[PDB]
Design a protein around this ligand. Structure first.
Ligand SMILES: COP(=O)(O)OC[C@H](O)COP(=O)(O)OC[C@@H](COCC[C@@H](C)CCCC(C)CCCC(C)CCCC(C)C)OCC[C@@H](C)CCC[C@H](C)CCC[C@@H](C)CCCC(C)C
Ligand SMILES: COP(=O)(O)OC[C@H](O)COP(=O)(O)OC[C@@H](COCC[C@@H](C)CCCC(C)CCCC(C)CCCC(C)C)OCC[C@@H](C)CCC[C@H](C)CCC[C@@H](C)CCCC(C)C
Ligand SMILES: COP(=O)(O)OC[C@H](O)COP(=O)(O)OC[C@@H](COCC[C@@H](C)CCCC(C)CCCC(C)CCCC(C)C)OCC[C@@H](C)CCC[C@H](C)CCC[C@@H](C)CCCC(C)C
Ligand SMILES: COP(=O)(O)OC[C@H](O)COP(=O)(O)OC[C@@H](COCC[C@@H](C)CCCC(C)CCCC(C)CCCC(C)C)OCC[C@@H](C)CCC[C@H](C)CCC[C@@H](C)CCCC(C)C
Ligand SMILES: COP(=O)(O)OC[C@H](O)COP(=O)(O)OC[C@@H](COCC[C@@H](C)CCCC(C)CCCC(C)CCCC(C)C)OCC[C@@H](C)CCC[C@H](C)CCC[C@@H](C)CCCC(C)C
Ligand SMILES: COP(=O)(O)OC[C@H](O)COP(=O)(O)OC[C@@H](COCC[C@@H](C)CCCC(C)CCCC(C)CCCC(C)C)OCC[C@@H](C)CCC[C@H](C)CCC[C@@H](C)CCCC(C)C
Ligand SMILES: COP(=O)(O)OC[C@H](O)COP(=O)(O)OC[C@@H](COCC[C@@H](C)CCCC(C)CCCC(C)CCCC(C)C)OCC[C@@H](C)CCC[C@H](C)CCC[C@@H](C)CCCC(C)C
Ligand SMILES: COP(=O)(O)OC[C@H](O)COP(=O)(O)OC[C@@H](COCC[C@@H](C)CCCC(C)CCCC(C)CCCC(C)C)OCC[C@@H](C)CCC[C@H](C)CCC[C@@H](C)CCCC(C)C
Ligand SMILES: COP(=O)(O)OC[C@H](O)COP(=O)(O)OC[C@@H](COCC[C@@H](C)CCCC(C)CCCC(C)CCCC(C)C)OCC[C@@H](C)CCC[C@H](C)CCC[C@@H](C)CCCC(C)C
Ligand SMILES: *C/C=C(C)/C=C/C=C(C)/C=C/C1=C(C)CCCC1(C)C
Ligand SMILES: *C/C=C(C)/C=C/C=C(C)/C=C/C1=C(C)CCCC1(C)C
Ligand SMILES: *C/C=C(C)/C=C/C=C(C)/C=C/C1=C(C)CCCC1(C)C
Lengths: 222, 222, 222
């Protein structure tokens, strides 16, 4: 019996309707600037949608063995997180014209975080995961950093409005994101403390508040 | 016995010789503009070539079960279509200087179409495929649309020649492309109406007339 | 027993410390030009690092059968080479402002080389590999070429210093790179001449002298 069905039966709707919501509202008035934007942000919840639906249907659920059991690992998790994250980081650096340097970097720093996440997310040695967990977090903290001391531009010739619009998402990333290693850590694959049911939910409120909500928190603003 | 061998033994040659044909002819005279082009278009048939060869050799053929049989699904199909499609859409939007907005969008709209194609292209529930088929088509129709009402620029300061060169491919995409969901639909994995042999052929005439021919239909023109 | 452990236990350190070395030294003084650079080059050894670590731990080792045995094929090899190569080619074409034409081309020409490498790197017919080996090399020789007669710009309005800095890496790529088909050829999957132990080492001196060293051979210079 799969009782994660409901928390996973609810991330399709939310993410899915979130997309069906940005096109409708999506258009460009005088500067095909928001145009680049209005796009990205639709992609983020849309891509995810196939994933929540992909977990939801029972297709993204393997049964890897940690010397003592045979547990579930929704591999289709890192997949959705694989294409959304570099898209958000783009909504970011874009807004805050961020030298391509921190850009190519920004992403790769991302990429390598999820990938390794994946590796340590399927390994059959109860003691080889966690190490991979280090390198991943380790890396996370690198974008996170560059995101602070980093994207702190030289707000001089720009919209004396961005600031907030920026730091309000810049504060929603540092908080919302930093939660993943923490759950993944003790979830269904970390310590075996919190089992899937609750984790999986901990995971969707973490997602939505990160996408559906995110994009709004921005496109409503200039 | 594999009698799809011949229709699949012929897509290597066509696609393969099609490549060996664009480099030879490929060069740039006054504007490294066609340069960006002459490139893309070589990639399209070349990438494909490894794929027709990859199917052709018997390496891209799985045996997924639809509660009642055990049928073949050339997974190496969505692979070739995974990198060619975003390349063509580029030959397009390029030619028709198309705001990066419709661009990043164009592709992702593509991407998600093939990916999901893949998912519903390997699933073991005779009733979970088709749904995925919806989301894929559903999406197709989104680029298709933006391709019409969409790429209809403001032909003002440009080559009063593009138009045709454009709408002739723009008419070759809307027709040739829209055939895939229709075959995949009843092919060897849809309904089990048309078996592989014929499908596979339906599939290669669909491909070539889409690449070998395509690129020509363009680079011959200015 | 795995005696490749040491040669693979040493590529983590080298590549790993090589990264920990470019950030530290990595910064931008007057032109966020080196900025684009200082980035790429950190990625190259870093990405690799997870891979040497991924081989090193025993996670990237399959057991494919060549009609007569059951041999090892560190599939996690083409993975690291999948993202580093298009990054180096970028350190290159960048430095030598290289029309996007040769650029998009440069990479795809790369991409298809490793991919096919992979295909012929896992196939279970002792006689179908080598063919794939052809198409791969075949392709290699295409970037290699464009790298010579090709990137030979029109050194006119530029740093009368690049030249060397260029041809010294341009000479380190043509030599160091061209060795892979040659080892892969007779290694543990080609002819079965040189077994893993030595190959694997032949392979890491080939790597480092290609990355750790590479990047240095450049960023030290202007
Ligand atoms: C079978 O054996 P075994 O495997 O061993 O056991 C395992 C056992 O199945 C475990 O669970 P449980 O034991 O609890 O039983 C099962 C279940 C009983 O129900 C069955 C009905 C299910 C199928 C309906 C689910 C609805 C859903 C996930 C859609 C949510 C999307 C909407 C509409 C909101 C978006 C718009 C909004 C912003 C206005 O319970 C769990 C079911 C309940 C929690 C469902 C009701 C609440 C949810 C939150 C709203 C959906 C209601 C809709 C009808 C519309 C109204 C909303 C709005 C428009 C006003
Ligand atoms: C009954 O049980 P039992 O049988 O006993 O148990 C037995 C058990 O159930 C079954 O077997 P096994 O244990 O062997 O399972 C092994 C299984 C796991 O590997 C999955 C592949 C994952 C690990 C790789 C994806 C991430 C990645 C490539 C890391 C680096 C990515 C970066 C940094 C890019 C960003 C950089 C930026 C600058 C742009 O498959 C092994 C599969 C192999 C046999 C096949 C070949 C490998 C793949 C297909 C090639 C590489 C492709 C990548 C590009 C992936 C795409 C995403 C990527 C870009 C992030
Ligand atoms: C510089 O001055 P400034 O005033 O900024 O001037 C400029 C001018 O005012 C421009 O306005 P701005 O935009 O800055 O306004 C303000 C801004 C605030 O950000 C808030 C971010 C949201 C995500 C968080 C709200 C909670 C909060 C701030 C309280 C802190 C305490 C916590 C975290 C709880 C601890 C409890 C613990 C025990 C668990 O935005 C406001 C906009 C939002 C209303 C947007 C909507 C988001 C929703 C959540 C998602 C939508 C989709 C849902 C249906 C999916 C999920 C539902 C479900 C599963 C939960
Ligand atoms: C074995 O048991 P089982 O598995 O149970 O059965 C299963 C049973 O094998 C199923 O099939 P079938 O029963 O029919 O028998 C098998 C077969 C008999 O043949 C064997 C010869 C095969 C190997 C030759 C195939 C040729 C090919 C696919 C290349 C096409 C590329 C070219 C040259 C064109 C591009 C240039 C052009 C634009 C000028 O038949 C099927 C074979 C015939 C259909 C092949 C002949 C026609 C094709 C279209 C042209 C190739 C001819 C070349 C020699 C050059 C001439 C062209 C030009 C340059 C002037
Ligand atoms: C005897 O028979 P039996 O044993 O009983 O039957 C048992 C049977 O035969 C064997 O087992 P199973 O049923 O479990 O098979 C499950 C099998 C299928 O999954 C294949 C992976 C496919 C589904 C994923 C590719 C597409 C994708 C990621 C969708 C979204 C892509 C978008 C939207 C990008 C464009 C966006 C734009 C903005 C740039 O593998 C399951 C494999 C897992 C165990 C391993 C981990 C997953 C992978 C490797 C990580 C994700 C990588 C992706 C980036 C893929 C690359 C392409 C992508 C970019 C399009
Ligand atoms: C605005 O005015 P305009 O006049 O445009 O002025 C500007 C100036 O004239 C510039 O010229 P342009 O370019 O526009 O000229 C015209 C243009 C027309 O497009 C035609 C597209 C091709 C793909 C389709 C031809 C068929 C047709 C138009 C008839 C309609 C009826 C159908 C579809 C059949 C229904 C039957 C049903 C029962 C099945 O191009 C002409 C160029 C072509 C000759 C290019 C070559 C393509 C070939 C097919 C592929 C090459 C490789 C092959 C060896 C592989 C496959 C072979 C095999 C498997 C089939
Ligand atoms: C078990 O059964 P079975 O599977 O059948 O057999 C199979 C049988 O295990 C096969 O191998 P072998 O039979 O040979 O026995 C095994 C082994 C015995 O050792 C065990 C100790 C191992 C664990 C230590 C390895 C060290 C390593 C790979 C790190 C290198 C990185 C550094 C420090 C250099 C970077 C900085 C530099 C530029 C300053 O041997 C093989 C072990 C020896 C080759 C190791 C010593 C030399 C290496 C090159 C340097 C590392 C030394 C460090 C302590 C620091 C000093 C360097 C510097 C800072 C001054
Ligand atoms: C006990 O032993 P036994 O069981 O008897 O033996 C049985 C034995 O052990 C187990 O089974 P099998 O033999 O069937 O193994 C088959 C296995 C191998 O395939 C691995 C996938 C590799 C081959 C594909 C990666 C490379 C690629 C896509 C080539 C082209 C790339 C280019 C040119 C891009 C650059 C272009 C540029 C312009 C940007 O998996 C088969 C897996 C399938 C079932 C699942 C679906 C396929 C995948 C997931 C979708 C495609 C994703 C790609 C985008 C890959 C990512 C990297 C790429 C970008 C380079
Ligand atoms: C145009 O005039 P120019 O004079 O250029 O004026 C401009 C001004 O002079 C600017 O200076 P430039 O930069 O051009 O200076 C010169 C340049 C030379 O390039 C040399 C490249 C290195 C990679 C190769 C050195 C060997 C050589 C040239 C001899 C040839 C014979 C061979 C190949 C052996 C045959 C034997 C066979 C039997 C095996 O650079 C010098 C910089 C280097 C010192 C950089 C450091 C690289 C090291 C190797 C890697 C670092 C990390 C290691 C810890 C990892 C691996 C260790 C281990 C496993 C091996
Ligand atoms: C829309 C989805 C988002 C923003 C997902 C973000 C995910 C992370 C920041 C994940 C981090 C992880 C680690 C640092 C280590 C273990 C594995 C992960 C993927 C949970
Ligand atoms: C060179 C190859 C090309 C242009 C391939 C195009 C493929 C499609 C438009 C495929 C569409 C599909 C669906 C809409 C649903 C089912 C799966 C596909 C991939 C056949
Ligand atoms: C940092 C890693 C680098 C620069 C790796 C380069 C690898 C190659 C040039 C590999 C070439 C191959 C072939 C031409 C055929 C067989 C397979 C390969 C991948 C070894």
């Amino acid at each position: 019996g799969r009782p994660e069905w409901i928390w996973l039966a609810l991330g399709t709707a939310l993410m899915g309707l979130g997309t069906l919501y940005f096109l409708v509202k999506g258009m460009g008035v005088s500067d095909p600037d928001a145009k680049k934007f209005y796009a990205i942000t639709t992609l983020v919840p849309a891509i995810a949608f196939t994933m929540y639906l992909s977990m939801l249907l029972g297709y993204g659920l393997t049964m890897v063995p940690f010397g003592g059991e045979q547990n579930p690992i929704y591999w289709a998790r890192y997949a959705d997180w694989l294409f959304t994250t570099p898209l958000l980081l783009l909504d970011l650096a874009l807004l805050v014209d961020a030298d391509q340097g921190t850009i190519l970097a920004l992403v790769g720093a991302d990429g390598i975080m999820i990938g390794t996440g994946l590796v340590g997310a399927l390994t059959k040695v109860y003691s080889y995961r966690f190490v991979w967990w280090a390198i991943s977090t380790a890396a996370m903290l690198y974008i996170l950093y560059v995101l602070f001391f980093g994207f702190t531009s030289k707000a001089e010739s720009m919209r004396p409005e961005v600031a907030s619009t920026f730091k309000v998402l810049r504060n929603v990333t540092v908080v919302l994101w930093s939660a993943y290693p923490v759950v993944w850590l003790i979830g269904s694959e970390g310590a075996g403390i919190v089992p899937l049911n609750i984790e999986t939910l901990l995971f969707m409120v973490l997602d939505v508040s990160a996408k559906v909500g995110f994009g709004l928190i921005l496109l409503r603003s200039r």
